[PDB]
Design a protein around this ligand. Structure first.
Ligand SMILES: CN(C)C(=O)c1ccc2c(c1)CCCN2
Length: 185
């Protein structure tokens, strides 16, 4: 792909974070803490899952960013509507305002309803995310495998401003403590 030139500097929004997340001083890394992180509750925080949004809102144009997923067993990445549900249980689907992929139990899947099996020969250590607002496209790229395409959502009905979306995953196993990191431009 040749999307790198639409690179945007993403930072994480602390106020949207689940209360167990630890966001770095530079707002470019997030990981699961082993306890509540001593913050007040608010209506923006994702309650049920270890999720956080980027601060940036996009309503037009082309945007690209990259995320490091090294040594994680589980995570979700993509974009979502600014107005997505924060409290209670929900599925990651375009009907609910999410355009995402994930790793879970040694398989990669796109967040369609129902979910779609992905075919990845080289397990990615860094993921590229491309959004074309006007075209209604969200695409995912395997940076470890020379930028190979992972998945394209097309005919997207965004229906609002978009925000970068992150889920560091549960760490029941003790094998998923590593952070998500926004990679340098
Ligand atoms: C309990 N452990 C070890 C987890 O991995 C975990 C999973 C989900 C979740 C939380 C923790 C607190 C935030 C809300 N959801």
């Amino acid at each position: 792909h040749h999307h790198h030139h639409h690179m945007v500097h993403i930072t994480l929004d602390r106020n949207t974070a689940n209360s167990w997340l630890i966001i770095s001083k530079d707002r470019r890394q997030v990981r699961m803490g082993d306890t509540h992180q001593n913050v007040s509750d608010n209506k923006e925080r994702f309650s049920n899952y270890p999720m956080v949004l980027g601060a940036q809102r996009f309503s037009s144009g082309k945007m690209y960013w990259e995320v490091d997923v090294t040594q994680k067993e589980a995570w979700d990445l993509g974009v979502c509507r600014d107005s997505v549900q924060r409290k209670g249980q929900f599925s990651l689907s375009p009907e609910n305002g999410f355009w995402t992929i994930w790793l879970w139990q040694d398989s990669y899947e796109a967040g369609t309803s129902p979910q779609t099996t992905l075919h990845i020969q080289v397990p990615p250590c860094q993921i590229g995310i491309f959004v074309d607002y006007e075209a209604g496209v969200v695409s995912f790229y395997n940076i470890t495998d020379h930028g190979s395409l992972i998945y394209t959502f097309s005919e997207c009905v965004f229906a609002g401003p978009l925000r970068p979306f992150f889920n560091v995953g549960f760490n029941y196993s003790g094998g998923n403590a590593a952070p998500l990191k926004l990679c340098p431009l």
